[PDB]
Design a protein around this ligand. Sequence first.
Ligand SMILES: *[C@](O)(C(=O)NCc1ccccc1)[C@H](C[C@@H]1CCNC1=O)NC(=O)[C@H](CC1CC1)n1cccc(NC(=O)OC(C)(C)C)c1=O
Ligand SMILES: *[C@](O)(C(=O)NCc1ccccc1)[C@H](C[C@@H]1CCNC1=O)NC(=O)[C@H](CC1CC1)n1cccc(NC(=O)OC(C)(C)C)c1=O
Lengths: 305, 305
Amino acid sequence: SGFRKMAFPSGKVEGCMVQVTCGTTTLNGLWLDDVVYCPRHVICTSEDMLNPNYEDLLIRKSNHNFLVQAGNVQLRVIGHSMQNCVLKLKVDTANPKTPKYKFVRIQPGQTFSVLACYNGSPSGVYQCAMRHNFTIKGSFLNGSCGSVGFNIDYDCVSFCYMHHMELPTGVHAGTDLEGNFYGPFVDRQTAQAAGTDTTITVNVLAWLYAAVINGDRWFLNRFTTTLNDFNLVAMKYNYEPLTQDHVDILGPLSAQTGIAVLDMCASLKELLQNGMNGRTILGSALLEDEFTPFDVVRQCSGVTF
Amino acid sequence: SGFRKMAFPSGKVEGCMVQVTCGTTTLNGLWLDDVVYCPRHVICTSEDMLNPNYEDLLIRKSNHNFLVQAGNVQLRVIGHSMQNCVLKLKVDTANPKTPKYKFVRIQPGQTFSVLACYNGSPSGVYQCAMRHNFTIKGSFLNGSCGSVGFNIDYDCVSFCYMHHMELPTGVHAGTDLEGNFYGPFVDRQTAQAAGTDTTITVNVLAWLYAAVINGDRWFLNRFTTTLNDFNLVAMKYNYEPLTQDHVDILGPLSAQTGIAVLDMCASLKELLQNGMNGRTILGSALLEDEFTPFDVVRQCSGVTF
Ligand SMILES: *[C@](O)(C(=O)NCc1ccccc1)[C@H](C[C@@H]1CCNC1=O)NC(=O)[C@H](CC1CC1)n1cccc(NC(=O)OC(C)(C)C)c1=O
Ligand SMILES: *[C@](O)(C(=O)NCc1ccccc1)[C@H](C[C@@H]1CCNC1=O)NC(=O)[C@H](CC1CC1)n1cccc(NC(=O)OC(C)(C)C)c1=O
């Protein structure tokens, strides 16, 4: 047993990471088949960043202005196009290590692994979640742009995230792989504010179920509640409202433990109102909301890829 | 910026994971060159586990009793030997995907990434630390045995951990890759008890430095202290005594921030004595101790592999 913030194995994704340079700017790209994907702002110089006209900057460019490097090797760029906020560079070599893959758009509350990259090399791997203000709480430095987030389902890699920018308070914003930002953000260097964030209620409940599965059960009381009486307390704490769909999703965990979802809600209601008082749950002093139900199940049963 | 529990990219290690079966027992093995490593208790049946005589069990075995499977493929076992608590199975094929690697014995306080595996397939990756009682706080299920822990330096994989067992309170114990247990544990099914754990003081200080680097500075006060006055408070909280070697190790972080180590100690002294009072540091409500100074530097500067 035990319970950890767990990321997917990053192997299939490491073999797709390359370095892309255009003039003065080096960042990361994603090489699948004969196409490299990277943030379109690789074509900007630090002056252009205030309000770049990207199509203007782009026409001024030709195939050989983009240096794509795959480790030791140099790839040949035989075409380029721009889709929303990503650059598509057609190269002459298909990536032999391309995995089976899809491009997915995730929704607020869902989680994914991030492979943090610098100069086409992977630096480290960590798990995080799309928040309700469409930011993520990442760990990104200069040169991390173009790093990607992903999930795995048996052998297929689902790419959901490409990293573009840092926002006030050290949170991060990026796009899906078709180049559309999550949230109301733009790839220009102007003042941008992330909205207010809410705790992902359904994920907190899933993590409470994981604690029970693992032996930590001191927080279980003997009351029950309704959705309305729960939502009434939850929203005075900026928890996301719980819906009947959320109850349904937690069904399997409720089954595995024998604890009805609305009883677990009663335990959470009393946790919110009365605090932890120095106790921890699964080694944490806070209520962890970056485990989805499907994460808890995946880790507590042993799903491999 | 930002700061996450970050694991190493697991690619180089995924290509070394295989499934080993012997009679009734399937677990994981580590395939480097023409040798597969796995826990010697793969040769035990559930009745032998109370007090196995391993050399007796082992002589009763022959090369073909060990089924080694590398994904789709079956490997042929042309020899076997036992070193302390690991089994060495010589196979007829060298692993083409073997990375540059070493076997290292890690000390209490040091960290490493764990690639959690089931039936030779990787399930997930997470970071953890060798505790001062020689346990680790892992996430391991039935069939996880033989999963390994590792670090990376440039291109070389340092293997430090092979997983063997669960102990009371859901902590875990295993060996280095030469088959010697960390701590006073044995691979028999008898009552074994993890000892008293201490907080890794030098790592807490490193994480406080990471918070400052990332703009979380509310806990900084304006006092200083000495080693003795710090150790006096720390040991009243089961923190590990801080030594002059520990001060020295934190030098670089102290340099990068401009905050002397003994001033940061004064901030920690007041954190211990006065608690967080509902504030968080880098998103946590507890004092994190599973980031070494190297880790903080690694993540806040962008070291790639
Ligand atoms: C990303 O472009 C990147 O990695 N580029 C390669 C590179 C950048 C700098 C030096 C060498 C190589 C960065 C990633 C950022 C940088 C630090 N941590 C990150 O997540 N993204 C940007 O720099 C981004 C450009 C996007 C298109 C508009 N950018 C530009 C200007 C300002 C900010 N953010 C900012 O000012 O942060 C606050 C907190 C508001 C001060 C920005 O993300
Ligand atoms: C490991 O051997 C393994 O994965 N074996 C393959 C396998 C086991 C069971 C079913 C199918 C396939 C396990 C890993 C354990 C199991 C669950 N989580 C883990 O980390 N290691 C053991 O089972 C271990 C054998 C080691 C040589 C002595 N073992 C045996 C008997 C008891 C325990 N622990 C235990 O009883 O835990 C407490 C908390 C004390 C109840 C044990 O780890």
